[PDB]
Every structure is written in C-alpha cells, then in structure tokens.
Amino acid sequence: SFSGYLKLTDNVYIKNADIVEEAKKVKPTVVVNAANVYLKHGGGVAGALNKATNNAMQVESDDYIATNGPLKVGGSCVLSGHNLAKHCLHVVGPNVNKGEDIQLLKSAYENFNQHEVLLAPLLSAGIFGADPIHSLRVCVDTVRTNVYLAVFDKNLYDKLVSSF
Ligand SMILES: O=C(O)[C@H](CC1CC1)Nc1ncnc2[nH]ccc12
C-alpha cells in the first residue's frame, strides 16, 4: 500500500511526507518512532505520533517504563501501533544536542533488521541534531529489510535526493 516513493536502493525507498499522515493512509505492520530512552513523546516525530493516538501511546509507554526502566541509546522496544499501525517500533538514535555518541546511529538502525517492512523517519535527524545526509547513508549501509522513509521537510527531501 506504499505509493509515490522514490527508489534509492534494492530495499530503501523515500518520500516527502508527514509520517503520521502516511501511517493513517497505509496502516503499515510497523511504524518506527524516533524515541528517547524515557519514551517521553514530546516533540518531533514522537510528539506527532503520540498526538495522533490521542495520548494512548504515552499511557502505554509510561507503563512500559514503570515495568522495565529506560531503553539504551541505540536500542528499541516493540509496542502497540494503536490506530496508526499494527506495531510501533520505538528506536532511540543518539541525540547530538544532548551529547550522545553518533557511532550509536548504526546500532539504532540495526533494530530495523528484525522487521520485514517498516515505515520510518530518518533517525537522529530534526531536533536530535545529527546531519540528515549522514543518517540516510547509515540507513542504506545498515538496513537489509524493506524500509519506506518519510521525510517531512520538502527542502531537506530535495537535498537528500540530489546528494545521494
Ligand atoms: O524533515 C524531517 O524528516 C526531519 C525531522 C523532523 C520531522 C521531525 N527534519 C529535519 N532534519 C534535519 N535538519 C532539518 N532542518 C530543518 C528541518 C530538518
């Protein structure tokens, strides 16, 4: 059900789209969230996905943290996708703005290999502070399963395609 994506490699496709709108239309098996270790979904992709679930994602996430404690930077957990997808894979890329190691970005993308097909954002981009060109390069060099990347900003999408 994914449509309008540009093919970058055998397994990586990209589109200029709002990942929330894309999840509502497609209802994928897995949507990836750009999470933090506490699963506090305040802003960016996490805030937008959570708002679209009417805060059900945050209620489920607070119960997960109360039981299990925080995730690691580079780690992930599988929770419900609520009204957006079957599952949500919450993946923690390093936040440069908070001083986290950029080498952990490859470990973060390795989580995608546990799922056959995913709708995802570029990890560590936006308010996480990493260079999005670098994030797309690490994605294409790490993920082996089928990943459909939604890039929100039009100008960034054009820059990523032309420089690939
Ligand atoms: O458009 C995106 O998909 C990302 C993440 C954002 C959607 C949460 N945006 C950006 N990422 C890196 N540098 C940027 N400069 C301006 C925008 C921008």
mmCIF file of C-alpha atoms in Angstrom, residues 36-42 50 55-71 77 79 82 90:
data_model
loop_
_atom_site.group_PDB
_atom_site.id
_atom_site.type_symbol
_atom_site.label_atom_id
_atom_site.label_comp_id
_atom_site.label_asym_id
_atom_site.label_seq_id
_atom_site.Cartn_x
_atom_site.Cartn_y
_atom_site.Cartn_z
ATOM 1 C CA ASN A 36 14.140 8.888 23.604
ATOM 2 C CA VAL A 37 15.219 6.449 26.358
ATOM 3 C CA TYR A 38 12.367 7.506 28.652
ATOM 4 C CA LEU A 39 9.695 7.128 25.921
ATOM 5 C CA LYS A 40 8.595 10.747 26.645
ATOM 6 C CA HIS A 41 6.894 11.654 23.368
ATOM 7 C CA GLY A 42 7.005 15.451 23.500
ATOM 8 C CA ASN A 50 1.524 10.284 20.158
ATOM 9 C CA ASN A 55 -2.136 10.091 24.043
ATOM 10 C CA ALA A 56 -2.700 6.306 24.135
ATOM 11 C CA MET A 57 0.940 5.804 23.023
ATOM 12 C CA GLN A 58 2.203 7.816 26.016
ATOM 13 C CA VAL A 59 -0.035 5.902 28.514
ATOM 14 C CA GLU A 60 1.250 2.570 27.168
ATOM 15 C CA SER A 61 4.848 3.867 27.180
ATOM 16 C CA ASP A 62 4.664 5.043 30.814
ATOM 17 C CA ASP A 63 3.504 1.559 31.873
ATOM 18 C CA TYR A 64 6.414 0.005 29.867
ATOM 19 C CA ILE A 65 8.996 2.279 31.578
ATOM 20 C CA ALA A 66 7.476 1.694 35.063
ATOM 21 C CA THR A 67 7.974 -2.078 34.473
ATOM 22 C CA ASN A 68 11.265 -2.203 32.541
ATOM 23 C CA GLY A 69 13.183 1.046 33.104
ATOM 24 C CA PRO A 70 14.638 3.135 30.302
ATOM 25 C CA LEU A 71 15.876 1.928 26.935
ATOM 26 C CA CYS A 77 11.188 -1.852 22.038
ATOM 27 C CA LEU A 79 4.732 -1.637 21.496
ATOM 28 C CA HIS A 82 -2.716 1.923 18.164
ATOM 29 C CA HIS A 90 10.363 2.770 19.328
#
